[PDB]
Design a protein around this nucleic acid. Structure first.
Ligand SMILES: [Mg+2]
Ligand SMILES: [Mg+2]
Ligand SMILES: [Mg+2]
Length: 414
DNA sequence: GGGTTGGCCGAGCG
């Protein structure tokens, strides 16, 4: 039925957005009550559950057998009324970057209701989000946060004083009172969630419904910092919980800290005292892995050297891991890592930083090709592993021709 | 503030 079930859902989303663009919150709550009680909404709910690797909960259920789809949506045809939330399965996922990050595992019926009210919340949250909120929206990458940082902080387009701040509180530490105050919902179901734990209390508020909440909480900031009526002094650029606010002093940025601490005070949120520091460009703040400075009246969004270190930690871990593997496995595992840290910044000033990265992975590969043969000469390992393909010699890759793809060769789009 | 290439000294024993 999926030839249609995206379409009518999305048309109803469009109508909910048209309702929010005039006043008509009656129309909003009506069409949310309707899209919550559509067949197509429930079918989209069970697809967006089932295609996210469903596993064991306390209220255990299945994905497959292809009637549990149709009978599950036929069950929650009734289930808005006696819809009870059950708790989550507090179970880790054991990551390898240094922790075991928790992920509270909720019931698949609860996840179907999270997908239903998620696609009810979305068109209201598109039109009620800030014009410069770049976190987790539709059609917005982290790179357009840097593009907004460019047109905001270009030639004289600010005046050189920037707070870099960040939010305290681990989980949805928002006061549940305030969540029931103003989020466009049917507040029985929202009340039922927020009593029932609903997200295992090690969240970071950046379980797909929780970012919609964390966006809707943090969208008064732009119109509240429109209180400062200066030319380009205060601009807010925000990725989901990282924002930097411009200025031209350290005291008018103390006005902005007072405003923002009043704004977060209405919730359970605060700017800290430790992280939140005003800093004069050109000295520089690190924004989403990108360092912003001026370097004497340029901008130079460089990828910061706490992004470079995490990248070389990824490659160092791969080549300590494939320490005695095949060469073609080392090609096949290093190649997506380098291509991923390539296309994530193929837009800004990264070319020289790409060459220093390719130097650095070359010496990692030379200790690769030289550790592996313990008593053979260096011309032997060189012509064994590194094979000339163009003008250049020292291309890591043998045979056609399969070889590592250089991060230096990624052709930056201005 | 985008492009392109370099790096490799040999030998014996285990
Ligand atoms: Mg250099
Ligand atoms: Mg021996
Ligand atoms: Mg022996």
């Amino acid at each position: 039925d999926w030839a249609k079930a995206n379409r009518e859902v999305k048309r109803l989303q469009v109508r909910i957005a048209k309702a929010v663009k005039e006043g008509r919150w009656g129309k909003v709550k009506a069409l949310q009550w309707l899209l919550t009680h559509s067949f197509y909404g429930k079918a989209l709910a069970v697809k967006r559950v089932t295609d996210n690797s469903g596993s064991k909960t306390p209220g255990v259920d299945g994905i497959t057998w292809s009637t549990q789809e149709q009978k599950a949506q036929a069950i929650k045809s009734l289930r808005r009324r006696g819809y009870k939330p059950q708790p989550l399965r507090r179970v880790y996922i054991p990551k390898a970057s240094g922790k075991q990050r928790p992920l509270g595992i909720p019931t698949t019926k609860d996840r179907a209701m999270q997908a239903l009210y998620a696609l009810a919340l979305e068109p209201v949250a598109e039109t009620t989000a800030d014009r410069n909120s770049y976190g987790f929206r539709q059609g917005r990458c982290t790179a357009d946060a840097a593009g907004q940082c460019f047109t905001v902080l270009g030639r004289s387009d600010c005046a050189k004083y920037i707070l870099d701040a960040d939010i305290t509180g681990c989980f949805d530490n928002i006061s549940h009172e305030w969540l029931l105050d103003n989020i466009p919902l049917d507040k029985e179901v929202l009340r039922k969630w927020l009593k029932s734990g609903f997200v295992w209390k090690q969240q970071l508020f950046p379980g797909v419904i929780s970012p919609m909440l964390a966006n809707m909480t943090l969208d008064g900031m732009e119109e509240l910092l429109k209180k400062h009526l200066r030319k380009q002094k205060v601009n807010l650029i925000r990725y989901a919980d990282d924002f930097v606010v411009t200025g031209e002093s350290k005291e008018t940025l103390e006005k902005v800290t007072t405003v923002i601490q009043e704004f977060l005070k209405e919730r359970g949120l605060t700017l800290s005292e430790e992280k939140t520091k005003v800093v004069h460009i050109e000295e520089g703040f690190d924004f989403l892995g990108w360092n912003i400075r001026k370097y004497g009246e340029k901008l130079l969004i460089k990828p910061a050297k706490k992004n470079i270190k995490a990248f070389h930690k990824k490659i160092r871990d791969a080549l300590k891991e494939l320490r005695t593997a095949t060469q073609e496995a080392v090609i096949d595992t290093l190649n997506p890592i380098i291509k991923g840290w390539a296309n994530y910044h193929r837009n800004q000033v990264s070319k020289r930083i790409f060459n220093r990265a390719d130097d650095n992975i070359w010496h990692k590969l030379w200790r690769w090709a030289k550790r592996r043969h313990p008593n053979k000469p260096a011309r032997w390992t060189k012509n064994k592993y590194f094979i000339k393909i163009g003008n250049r010699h020292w291309v890591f890759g043998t045979w056609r021709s399969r070889y590592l793809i250089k991060a230096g060769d990624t052709r930056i789009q201005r």
